Amino acid sequence: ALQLLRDHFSPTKPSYQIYMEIFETKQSYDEVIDSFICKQRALLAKLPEGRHDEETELDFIYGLMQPKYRESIPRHEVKTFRELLDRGRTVERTR
Amino acid sequence: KGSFSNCTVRFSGQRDHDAVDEFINAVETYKEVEGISDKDALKGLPLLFKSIAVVWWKGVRRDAKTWSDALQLLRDHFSPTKPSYQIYMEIFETKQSYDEVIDSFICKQRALLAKLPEGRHDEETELDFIYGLMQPKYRESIPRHEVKTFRELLDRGRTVERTR
Amino acid sequence: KGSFSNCTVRFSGQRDHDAVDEFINAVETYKEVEGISDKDALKGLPLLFKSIAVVWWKGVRRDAKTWSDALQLLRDHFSPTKPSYQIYMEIFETKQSYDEVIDSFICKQRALLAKLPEGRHDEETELDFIYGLMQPKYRESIPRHEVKTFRELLDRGRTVERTR
Amino acid sequence: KGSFSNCTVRFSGQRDHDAVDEFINAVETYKEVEGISDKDALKGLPLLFKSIAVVWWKGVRRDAKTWSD
Numbered sequence: 001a002l003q004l005l006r007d008h009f010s011p012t013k014p015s016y017q018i019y020m021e022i023f024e025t026k027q028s029y030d031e032v033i034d035s036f037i038c039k040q041r042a043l044l045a046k047l048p049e050g051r052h053d054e055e056t057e058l059d060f061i062y063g064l065m066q067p068k069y070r071e072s073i074p075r076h077e078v079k080t081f082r083e084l085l086d087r088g089r090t091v092e093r094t095r
Numbered sequence: 096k097g098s099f100s101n102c103t104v105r106f107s108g109q110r111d112h113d114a115v116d117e118f119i120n121a122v123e124t125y126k127e128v129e130g131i132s133d134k135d136a137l138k139g140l141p142l143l144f145k146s147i148a149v150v151w152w153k154g155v156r157r158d159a160k161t162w163s164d165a166l167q168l169l170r171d172h173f174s175p176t177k178p179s180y181q182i183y184m185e186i187f188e189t190k191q192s193y194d195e196v197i198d199s200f201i202c203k204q205r206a207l208l209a210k211l212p213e214g215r216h217d218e219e220t221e222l223d224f225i226y227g228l229m230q231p232k233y234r235e236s237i238p239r240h241e242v243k244t245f246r247e248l249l250d251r252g253r254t255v256e257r258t259r
Numbered sequence: 260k261g262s263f264s265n266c267t268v269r270f271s272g273q274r275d276h277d278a279v280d281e282f283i284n285a286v287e288t289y290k291e292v293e294g295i296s297d298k299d300a301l302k303g304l305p306l307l308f309k310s311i312a313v314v315w316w317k318g319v320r321r322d323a324k325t326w327s328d329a330l331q332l333l334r335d336h337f338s339p340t341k342p343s344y345q346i347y348m349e350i351f352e353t354k355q356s357y358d359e360v361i362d363s364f365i366c367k368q369r370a371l372l373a374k375l376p377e378g379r380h381d382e383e384t385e386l387d388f389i390y391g392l393m394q395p396k397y398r399e400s401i402p403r404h405e406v407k408t409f410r411e412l413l414d415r416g417r418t419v420e421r422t423r
Numbered sequence: 424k425g426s427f428s429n430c431t432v433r434f435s436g437q438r439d440h441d442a443v444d445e446f447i448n449a450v451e452t453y454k455e456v457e458g459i460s461d462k463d464a465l466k467g468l469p470l471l472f473k474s475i476a477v478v479w480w481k482g483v484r485r486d487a488k489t490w491s492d
Contacts, residue, residue, distance in 0.1 A: 032110065034172060035147070042150045093175060094399050178403050179384075184391025187351035215384060227344040239344060266429055268473075281477045285469060292426060292467050360438065363475070370478045410486075 018046055027066045033088045037061065058084065098131045099139035107146040108173055115174045119166065136162050179211060191230040197252040201225065218245065262295050263303035271310035272337065276374070279338050283330065297326045304329065346374050354392050361397070361416040365389075382409060426459050427467035435474035461490045 022043060027036055040061060061084065062075060072091055078084045104121040107114075122143075126136065137159070141152055151172070159165035170176060186207060191200055204225055208216075225248070226239050237251050266289070270282045286307070290300055301323065308316055315336070323329040350371060355364050368389055372380075380388075386409055401415050430453070434446045450471070454464055465487065472480055486492075 035108075038147075038151045038154060041154045045154070089175065090402065094395075179387045180390040180403060183388055184351075187348075215381075220379070223344040223347050227348040239342065260425070277478060280481070281473075284477070284481070288466075288469050292470070293428075362479075366475065366479045366482065369482045373482070 013046070015047065018043065022060065027064055029066055029068070031066075033065075033069070033085065033092065036064075037085065040064065054081065055079075057081065098129075098135055099142055101142065105143055105145060106148060108148045108151070110173065112174055112177070115170070119170065123166075133162055137165060140165070177210075182207070182210060186224065187228070190228055193230065193232075195230070197233065197256060198249065201249065204228075221245075222248075260293060262299050263306050265306070269307050269309050270312055272312045272315070274337060274339075276338055277370070279334070283334065287330070300326055301329060341374065343375065346371065350388065351392070355394050357394060357396070361413060361420060364393075365413060385409065386412065424457060426463050427470050429470070433471050433473050434476055436476045436479070464490055 058081060069088060073087055104118060106118045141149060144152055159168055233252060233255060236255055242248050268282060268285050305316055323332060397416060397419060400419055406412050432446060432449050469480055
């Protein structure tokens with residue numbers, strides 16, 4: 001009954017809709033990085049598991065961000081997904 | 096039995112320090128009052144999150160294995176846990192204005208000062224900052240070194256408030 | 260080798276803490292270096308005053324009997340030993356303006372923090388009281404909880420100053 | 424023959440390389456000419472400061488232990 005409730009309403013939409021959706025919205029200005037990375041991970045977790053390593057997700061998040069963050073955070077500094085938020089919140093607090 | 100059925104206090108992630116601090120305080124007092132054990136509280140946690148935050152709990156659930164680390168994560172992801180230096184540069188930030196009741200000012204100052212670490216400031220030290228920031232409607236007739244206890248400031252301020 | 264013959268440092272009566280403390284420390288240091296006895300040092304004290312203060316010494320000559328009493332009396336009649344709340348209001352009034360060196364700000368603020376009663380503050384809250392008034396030219400790079408002592412703040416301030 | 428009694432050259436805090444290097448070289452030269460020991464030279468060092476720098480020496484007194492330091 002739980003699977004029957006899941007099957008009709010949230011139908012596990014295919015891959016190309018998700019891949020076209022993760023690029024249909026950039027990061028608007030004066031928006032905090034926490035809700036952005038939360039919505040991006042929640043939309044990216046619909047993919048088949050085991051199809052993406054840890055390295056491939058980070059490049060997409062970096063490309064998506066506003067130029068408030070890209071000029072002070074360059075690529076190859078961060079590897080794990082937590083250090084991006086760790087180096088973002090300091091620049092946010094400094095403003 | 097029964098643990099964390101429902102209550103009025105629910106959390107929604109509104110990015111402000113006051114709401115998250117009141118939520119953490121209310122949950123922390125409810126945990127000691129009702130007698131909910133430590134290991135059983137982690138299972139009944141997503142009954143409170145009915146907001147954008149229930150999407151957030153699906154992402155970072157595996158980082159927490161104890162109640163204390165989960166509470167610290169809920170604090171860390173939403174509230175920047177302001178240090179002492181911003182508090183000290185924010186206390187003298189504003190002064191006292193005209194036509195303001197002294198009790199609201201003293202309540203605001205003590206509520207903004209009680210977030211400091213306990214045991215570093217005794218009773219003599221705190222009085223100096225409040226006396227320095229007093230509106231000169233109060234400082235002309237109430238000088239320093241006449242008051243010792245913290246009640247004496249309010250008890251001598253109410254008479255000057257009544258005298259008008 | 261003599262006993263207060265002639266020297267450059269004299270005292271006038273300028274009514275400030277810095278000049279009085281400098282004159283007293285220089286005289287106290289000279290007495291220790293040259294090696295003069297306590298009874299011989301008090302006879303040569305009007306050889307240093309040159310101003311209003313010598314008229315002050317023509318009147319209060321019969322109150323001094325030892326060297327320590329005369330030094331404490333000179334500290335008492337001129338240095339007014341300001342209370343605590345004026346100091347705590349004086350620290351938070353003037354922020355660090357742009358284009359000013361770190362070392363002048365740090366030495367002036369340390370000389371202002373020395374006026375409090377001794378033993379009331381540690382080193383950590385001392386640095387926490389000073390970390391809230393610096394320019395954003397220095398606060399963008401070095402964060403809190405990384406600088407533990409009062410020397411490493413200058414050690415990392417001189418690096419950012421050279422970099423520009 | 425004495426130990427830093429009084430002299431014309433003093434230091435203020437002018438924040439420049441030339442004045443600081445001149446003052447340090449003149450003091451270092453005077454110590455070598457007059458023949459003063461290293462332990463006796465550090466006790467007489469506040470007899471030369473006359474400015475903001477004496478307030479700087481009232482705070483950082485406990486960091487110095489030798490003459491070279």
